[PDB]
Every structure is written in structure tokens, then in C-alpha cells.
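Lab notebook, page 48
Experiment: co-folding of the full assembly
Goal: obtain a model of how the components sit together before planning crosslinking
Operator: M.T.
Materials (sequences as entered):
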Amino acid sequence: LGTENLYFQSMDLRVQELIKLICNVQAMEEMMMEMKYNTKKAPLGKLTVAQIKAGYQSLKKIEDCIRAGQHGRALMEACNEFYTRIPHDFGLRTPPLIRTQKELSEKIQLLEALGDIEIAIKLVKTELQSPEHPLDQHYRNLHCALRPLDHESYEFKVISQYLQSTHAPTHSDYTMTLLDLFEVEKDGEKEAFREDLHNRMLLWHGSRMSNWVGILSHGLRIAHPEAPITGYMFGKGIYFADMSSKSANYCFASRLKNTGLLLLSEVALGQCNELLEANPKAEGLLQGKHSTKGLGKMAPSSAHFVTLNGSTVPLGPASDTGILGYTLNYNEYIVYNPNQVRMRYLLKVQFNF
Ligand SMILES: NC(=O)c1cccc(N)c1
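Observation: model returned without errors.
Model output:
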């Protein structure tokens, strides 16, 4: 296979495995069935952006009911209509109400994945009579360079240390093994990026395996405009952690599906507005500042920071921040314009449960 790759001068084998993995539509099917989405009643191949937008609109109606204190018939009506637009498989049981921030957030995550799956299914379409290998066709449509890095390189070592040293103490249900590492160069990001802003940090972002084709092809995006604001602890920005496992939790890997990806991005934080508890309306509080920082109780300290190509890497271990209702365990950072983000590394990670 290695020799066969050299003679044909095909795409690098590691990149081939990465593309095959993220473009696997059968895995998207299984992932959505796991989230209770009824793929039999509404196949993913027929999913449209208008259907998904309608879904968000019904979630907003649910949010309105919750806000006005309608927890009986009107809420069960509004939940049923969401469920008509975004069919679920609850088998024989009463379709459950959506009543809490958590439950609303779960539905938003379902619709976010469906949005990325709609993107993926279009992107993966091939020209049957084309001489190009299907993987090359997929890769080109990403408009995003992915280059494997040498495991004996300094970059690989620092990123491995970042991964391990910021694995949080409260996320002890797994450890992570870095299987491979790719440099990311998304078309347009280098030119768009807010290089002028200070406090540029290399930060984590995790997502479900179904979402990477969307993320790489469109960049990290803020939430859909029709999505319920209450779905977002600090409003409709792009969320990042300085603790690898806080983000890795959003991979939703498991003992059954133990391979996930983690993204590192340069984030132009500028001046952070620091907040101690949830506020979905945080974006309106910036008043000229460039980012929101949710303050955690535990965080990497500046003593241990290194610089990698002009961005700060907040190496662990985490320690008490002196910061303290309920309070975040770990920091989170939100920027509200994609031009404050430049994706830089994609980690292929094995989760050990
Ligand atoms: N998706 C992520 O990696 C992440 C990072 C910080 C906060 C949240 N909610 C998510």
C-alpha cells in the first residue's frame, strides 16, 4: 500500500484515512440514531437546510413557552411540533417534554450536527466518470489543507504535552492517546485573521465526528440565528477551552467509538470581558472588548506557558485560580466573529475508557 501510494503519487495515506473517517456517512447515520433522530422516517440524504431552520424555529417557540411559564399543554404542543419537524424515535414511550436549558441544548446540538451532515452529504457527492479518486474529490471540496506532521517533531511534542498536561482532574473517565497530527490551513483564514489583537492563544475545540466536514469546509461558525439564545452559556460565539478534556468531552467518544478529533486554533482574544456565571446575553456586554472569558476555578498558569509561532500555549497542569452561586470548573473563551479564529492543528485521538 505504501509503495502503491508512491507510484500513483496519490494523497498521503494518513490524509486518506482522515478523509475516509470524517466523510463516512454510515457513521453519521449511526451517530444520529444514537441521538434519537429517526433516520428511517427522515433519511439524512433528504435533509434540507429549510427543514433544519424550521427545527430551530420550533425550539425558539419552546423557549418562549418556558420563558412565559407554560409547562403543561402549550409546552407539550410545542414539543410535539418540534418532533414533527425533526422526527425522533422514542419507540413506544411518550415523547418527552423539553423543559430545561440542558434539554433545549441537547436539541440544539442535534440540529447543529444535522446541519453539518447536510453539508457533508452534498460535499461527498462524486462525479462518477471523473478520473480523480473520490477521496481527492472530497478533500478539494473542503477548501482546507491537511498536512500530516512528523511524530519526532517539536510541534508534535508540544502539542502532545498540551494534550496531556491540560487533561482535567475531573475528567478521569478516560485518558487520551494522540494517534496522529495534521496541520490545518483553511483557505482565507490567514488573510481574514485579526493578527492585530493581543492575547492570541492556541486553544481547544471538540465536536462530534459527524461535524468535521462542516467545520473544515466552512470554518468554525457561530450558532444559527434562529437558535434559542438560552442554548448558549455566553451567547452565540465560537467556544474554546484551555483544558484539552473540557473540549474532548464534546467529541462524545465512547468505549464503542473510541476515536475522536480535537482541533487547535489560534484565537485572537483581544481584551476579554471576564464573567463568573452564565449569561446568554454576554455578547451585548462586550462594549468594545473582543471576547468573553468564562472564569474557571482551575487553570494552567503563566509560569508554564510556551509560545508556538506567535500564539501562547497554556501548558498545564491546572491550578487554583483563586476564583469563586455555582462556578465553572475550567475556563472557557468565546469570540463572536470567525475572523478571530485561525484553525491550526487537527489531532486524531484515541480515548482510553
Ligand atoms: N466544543 C468545545 O470544545 C467547547 C469549549 C468550551 C466550552 C464549550 N461549551 C465547548
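Interpretation: Residues 277 and 327 are 6 Å apart (CA to CA).
Next step: discuss with group before ordering constructs.
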